Design a protein around this ligand. Structure first.
Ligand SMILES: *C(=O)c1cc(N)ccc1[C@@H](OC(C)=O)C(=O)OC
Length: 240
């Protein structure tokens, strides 16, 4: 997260760290959202590599023991059938991770609330991006969970030429694009939490920023629109 502020410990308790085994250590790669005590939602992109992955719930500082962590193995990964590694701008940047165990829910560990199917937000809707990603373009990961206020930008503006054009599809949410605040690599997979009827709900799974840089005026961060996937997400869980 470019241009963000440290989050309070308990603000975003559905945030996870997606980590891979890196020699004899574990490194953060992605975010995600805990959606069931045994299921995480992230981006397909985050699991293109055939690596050994773990989930961290209740994470605040990547490098220090918070006294609130739970560390859980990934038992099965289910990527969207239409995801293609070579075409992110096609969309379907969505994955569901089944965990090797159910996590215990407490103040640091809650489920993410998903929108109703089909739900589209109005332009300039109040949303936050969270995550441990890079804090400048070509910079380094954050140690503590960062948040940025990132209002939405509706599809008609986002798909205009001076924005993303045709790169962006109505299966995606765009948010931000001020030049100052963004998602950045390491936030892929994470949540875009948006305030609807006085409750924060996860409308976005972080997908991409510009090759030109993370914080680029009129290049909003692009999310997979969760409301487009609710039938698929339910259909996976009921059967897996
Ligand atoms: C996501 O964590 C990530 C990581 C790496 N190494 C490259 C790209 C990405 C995505 O970044 C974000 C901000 O989502 C990405 O831009 O995918 C196209």
């Amino acid at each position: 997260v470019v241009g963000g502020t440290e989050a309070q410990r308990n603000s975003w308790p559905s945030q996870i760290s997606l980590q891979y085994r890196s020699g004899s250590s574990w490194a953060h790669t992605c975010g995600g959202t805990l959606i069931r005590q045994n299921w995480v939602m992230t981006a397909a992109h985050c699991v293109d590599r055939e690596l050994t992955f773990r989930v961290v719930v209740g994470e605040h500082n990547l490098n220090q023991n918070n006294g609130t962590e739970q560390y859980v193995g990934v038992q099965k990964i289910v990527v969207h059938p239409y995801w293609n590694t070579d075409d992110v701008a096609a969309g379907y940047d969505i994955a569901l991770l089944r965990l090797a165990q159910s996590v215990t829910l407490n103040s640091y560990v809650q489920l993410g609330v998903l929108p109703r199917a089909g739900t589209i937000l109005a332009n300039n809707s109040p949303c936050y991006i969270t995550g441990w990603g890079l804090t400048r373009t070509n910079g380094q990961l954050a140690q503590t969970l960062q948040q940025a206020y990132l209002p939405t930008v509706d599809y008609a503006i986002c798909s205009s030429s001076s924005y993303w054009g045709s790169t962006v599809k109505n299966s995606m949410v765009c948010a931000g694009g001020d030049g100052v605040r963004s998602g950045c690599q390491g936030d892929s997979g994470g949540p875009l939490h948006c305030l609807v009827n006085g409750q924060y709900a996860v409308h976005g799974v972080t997908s991409f920023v510009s090759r030109l840089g993370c914080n680029v005026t009129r290049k909003p961060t692009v999310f997979t629109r969760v409301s487009a996937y609710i039938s698929w997400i339910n259909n996976v869980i009921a059967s897996n």
